[PDB]
């Protein structure tokens, strides 16, 4: 909520599309990520108190999932490469500066 910077979209359906299932997403996780934190977990998503133990079972889930990219993808189905500029705005040295006059 305190991030100062970017969110920027563009269609990579013109490029990233194939069949590319390497593209992936976290469909479910048990909390929100901390500021700028990532969740790398390939761990089993555990729905019941029955431990899955690294195999599939009743409501045994791998939480991360993939987007099948269908080269007929439309505006709702197109991937958007998206970028976000982290910065604190002020209170630290100029790293990215402005083009000074």
């Amino acid at each position, epitope marked *: 909520d305190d991030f100062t910077g970017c969110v920027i979209a563009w*269609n990579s359906n013109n490029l990233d599309s194939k069949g590319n299932y390497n593209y992936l997403y976290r469909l479910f996780r048990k909390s929100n990520l901390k500021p700028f934190e990532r969740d790398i977990s390939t761990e089993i998503y555990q729905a019941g108190s029955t431990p899955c133990n690294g195999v599939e079972g009743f409501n045994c889930y791998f939480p991360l999932q993939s987007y099948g990219f269908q080269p007929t993808n439309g505006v709702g189905y197109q991937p958007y490469r998206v970028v976000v500029l982290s910065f604190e705005l002020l209170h630290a040295p100029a790293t990215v500066c402005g083009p000074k006059k």
Partner: antibody
Amino acid sequence: VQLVQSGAEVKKPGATVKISCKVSGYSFSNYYIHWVKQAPGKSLEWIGYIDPFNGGTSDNLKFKGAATLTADTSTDTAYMELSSLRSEDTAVYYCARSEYDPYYVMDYWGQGTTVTVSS
Amino acid sequence: IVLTQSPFQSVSPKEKVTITCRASQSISSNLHWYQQKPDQSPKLLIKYASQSISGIPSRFSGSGSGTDFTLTINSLEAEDFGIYFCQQTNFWPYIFGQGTKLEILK
């Protein structure tokens, strides 16, 4: 369904105009607002989009008024502050209801705000 | 990432007119058509380049092929014609058509 703008603003060039887009008839927080400029007898020109929940003000770079789109969530009113006014900024400024998801439709708008920037 | 329209089209009632929206380089399969009456807020005719917002005449259609997006009107009425706009989708600035004033003769 209802977007009502502050009336015409006549300034000297270099001065500042801020224009109110007052939402009613729908949910403000569920819709971005597009801000659309029509120079008199000229085409539709889109200065930026704003977010109700955030400072979601993108700016087109064709002209530059040091513009910032502020949305007042209590009154559901997005402002467009257009500074560094120029005689060409003279135009009818529409605000346009935008989707909140990344789909961009402006179905319904303000009534337009003429600004005459001149000495 | 800028789009091109024909400045003017003159047609007769019942005749079919097609106004093009021609975007440079890549195009986005969404587009938005607007009928601006003189001195009046343009109104969105065509959404996604394939659909009408509700209440808009069935003679108002839209499309795209290659880099062009058409504003296609079938069977005009002398009430219908007006200034027409297309709006680029995505690619940063929604770059609105230069506008097309439609005339209907007869």
